[PDB]
Every structure is written in C-alpha cells, then in structure tokens.
Amino acid sequence: SDVFNYKQNFHYEYDMLEMNGMSIAQLESYIRQERQKDRVFAGFLLEGFGSSAYATFQVCPDVGDCYEGSHFSVLGGSTEMPWAFDRLYKMEITDILQAMDLKFDSHFTIKTKIVAHNGTELPESLLPEATIVRIPPSAQNLEV
C-alpha cells in the first residue's frame, strides 16, 4: 500500500509518461475509441507450473482452415512460489475473425499449443482450453 506513492516515498520521476508518444489524454482517446468497436477476445485461465513457457493459439472454423492467433508467455522457475490467476487473461481476436469472414457466434474453435523453456511440448492438460467472449460496443459520445 505504501509502494503506490512513488514520488513522495521513493523520490523518483520519469522524464516522459507516454505510450508510443501518446499523451495520457490521447491514450484515453484511443482507448475509448477502441471501446466503441464491437470486439471479441480469447480468454485464458492461468495456473503456475514451475517453468517459463510460451503458448501459441490458432482460430479454426468448422472446417479447419486454421489461422494463427497471437502468442503469449509465462515466466517461471522450479523454485517459484505457486500462483493462480483469479481472472481471465484476454487477447483480442476481432481482426482475425473478421478476416475469416465469420461472425463471433458462428461455430469456431481455438486451439492452443504451448512449449516449455526446454522447450518440450507441455500437454493440453497443463492449461485449461481457452474461452471466448464478445464485448459489445458502448454507444456514447467521444472527443474525438
């Protein structure tokens, strides 16, 4: 709780608080604009398994035709204190779905292959298969 106030407690500043040259105002603008779109994410439920690994998932229509979805990584070692996320980690797939010409509610599955630091393939048993969520547009006025 005392780690929050970085300037008062630990006496340090940054020369620039910007994401890719964007002001926090501009950041919020971009963000809300993205909130105005119709979006769909793949959600992952993450447990700790004691080693670093990277996971790769793909999106597949009823007939396979698999397109590569984004990757993500986990950090680990054998001495790591056990952990479990109480939430879903979300990754956006709207663009790949739209490029696939299928809508969010039309019969498509997500398959994940995850390889270790070794890297040996960690069985599908390690992380529970992903879920999919569509978040709807929020219709309200923007700056813009």
Resolution at which this structure was determined, Å: 5.1
Pairing of strands 39-47, 131-135: antiparallel
Gyration radius (Cα) of the chain, Å: 19
Distance, in Å, from the CA atom of 76 to the CA atom of 79, rounded to the nearest integer, reads 8
User: How many residues are given for the chain?
Assistant: 144
Q: Is the dihedral of CA 93, 98, 104, 110 positive or negative?
A: negative
Which candidate, 11, 30, 10, 12, places its Cα nearest to that of 20?
A: 30
Q: Is the dihedral of CA 53, 58, 27, 34 positive or negative?
A: negative
Distance, in Å, from the CA atom of 33 to the CA atom of 140, rounded to the nearest integer, reads 10
CB 110 within 8 A of CB 72: no
CB proximity list for 67: less than 8 A, separation 6 or greater: 58, 59, 60, 96, 99, 100
Distance, in Å, from the CA atom of 31 to the CA atom of 36, rounded to the nearest integer, reads 9
